[PDB]
C-alpha cells in the first residue's frame, strides 16, 4: 500500500474478542514478513485521534544537514627551506565522505543514494607561536578553492599556472567573508551513488575493492592567493557537505563496531562491551536482571 502519510495512524476502539479460527497475535517469522498484529487485536483499545506529524523522519530531513567532510591545517609562511612533505601555502584533498564517522554512518544506512551536494568552506587563521613570535594580528587573506575533476592536472605549487583555471570551477573568498558556499550536482555516471560496492575498480585483479569507479569525484585544491609575509600563520580550512534532493534505496543495518579506515569496512571492535566484536551490547548479571529497577 503506497499512500501519503503525514501523521501517525489513529487508534480505533475494540471490544472483547473470542472467535474460533482467528488468531491475530500468532505469526510466522519464517515467511520473512513482520507481524501484522494490531494493538486493537491484542488489547482492548479506545479511539485516539493521532495528530503526530512524520515530517522529521523524511529521508531528506534526516540527511539534509551540513556535516564536516574535510579539515586541513597548513602553514602560510615562507616555504623555501621546508621539506617536500608539508603543504606549502596550499593543499589538495581527494574528495570522500568516509573520513568523519557521523556523516559516514548516516550515509551508510542506505545502499544507493542520489543527491546534490551543498559545499560550505569555513577558514580560520592563527598566529604561529613557534620560536619567539608574537600575536601581531590576524591578516584578512584571500583563498582560492578549485575543483579539479578526474583526469585534470592538479597544482604542484602555490603559484603554478594551474591556478589560472580557464575551465576548472574556482571560488575566491576572504576570511572576513561568510563561509563560501556552492552547489555540486549529482555527478555520478550512474543513476545513484554506490555507498557500498561489492566489486573491484579495474579490469585486472589488483584493483581496489569496495570503491566504485563510477562514484569518483576528483580533487579540491585550496590555496592562499596572498603571497607569504614576514611572519608565519596557521590556516585551517573546514569543508562541510549537505545533501539535498535526496533519493535513497535499500536501507542497511547500522554499523556497530568503530570504523578502522576510510578505504574499507574493516572491523576490530572495542576491547570490552559495548560495541565489542563478541558483545555489541553491554552485559548484565543475567537474563533475569534489570539494572535500572525502580525500588521503593
Amino acid at each position: 500500500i503506497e499512500s501519503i502519510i503525514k501523521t501517525a495512524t489513529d487508534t480505533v476502539k475494540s471490544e472483547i474478542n473470542a472467535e474460533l479460527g482467528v488468531v491475530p497475535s500468532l505469526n510466522a517469522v519464517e515467511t520473512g514478513a513482520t507481524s501484522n498484529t494490531e494493538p486493537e487485536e491484542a488489547i482492548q483499545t479506545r479511539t485516539v485521534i493521532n495528530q503526530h506529524g512524520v515530517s522529521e523522519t523524511l529521508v531528506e530531513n534526516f540527511l539534509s544537514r551540513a556535516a564536516l567532510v574535510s579539515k586541513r591545517s597548513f602553514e602560510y609562511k615562507d616555504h623555501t627551506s621546508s621539506t617536500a612533505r608539508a603543504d606549502k601555502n596550499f593543499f589538495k584533498w581527494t574528495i570522500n565522505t568516509r573520513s568523519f564517522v557521523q556523516l559516514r554512518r548516516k550515509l551508510e544506512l542506505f545502499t544507493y543514494l542520489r543527491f546534490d551536494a551543498e559545499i560550505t568552506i569555513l577558514t580560520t587563521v592563527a598566529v604561529n607561536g613557534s620560536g619567539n613570535n608574537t600575536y601581531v594580528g590576524l591578516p584578512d587573506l584571500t583563498l582560492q578553492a578549485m575543483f579539479v575533476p578526474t583526469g585534470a592536472l592538479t597544482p604542484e605549487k602555490q603559484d603554478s599556472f594551474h591556478w589560472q583555471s580557464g575551465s576548472n570551477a574556482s571560488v575566491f573568498f576572504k576570511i572576513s567573508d561568510p563561509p563560501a558556499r556552492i552547489t555540486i550536482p549529482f555527478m555520478c555516471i550512474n543513476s545513484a551513488y554506490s555507498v557500498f560496492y561489492d566489486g573491484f575498480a579495474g579490469f585486472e585483479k589488483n584493483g581496489l575493492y569496495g570503491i566504485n569507479p563510477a562514484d569518483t569525484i576528483g580533487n579540491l585544491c585550496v590555496r592562499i592567493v596572498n603571497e607569504h609575509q614576514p611572519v608565519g600563520f596557521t590556516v585551517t580550512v573546514r569543508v562541510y557537505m549537505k545533501p539535498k534532493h535526496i533519493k535513497a534505496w535499500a536501507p542497511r543495518p547500522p554499523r556497530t563496531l568503530p570504523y578502522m579506515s576510510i578505504a574499507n569496512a574493516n572491523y576490530k571492535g572495542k576491547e570490552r562491551a559495548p560495541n565489542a566484536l563478541s558483545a555489541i551490547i553491554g552485559n548484565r548479571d543475567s537474563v533475569k536482571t534489570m539494572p535500572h529497577n525502580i525500588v521503593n
Partner: peptide, 30 residues
C-alpha cells in the same frame, strides 16, 4: 523559496515527499 539560479539543482531541499510504502520491507511476500 527564491532560487534565482538558472540550474534547477541549485534549489533548496525538497522536504515535501510524504508518500511511503513500508510493505516493501515488512510484507515482501507474494
Amino acid at each position: 523559496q527564491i532560487n534565482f539560479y538558472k540550474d534547477s539543482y541549485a534549489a533548496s531541499a525538497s522536504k515535501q515527499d510524504f508518500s511511503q510504502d513500508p510493505s516493501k520491507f515488512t510484507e515482501p511476500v507474494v
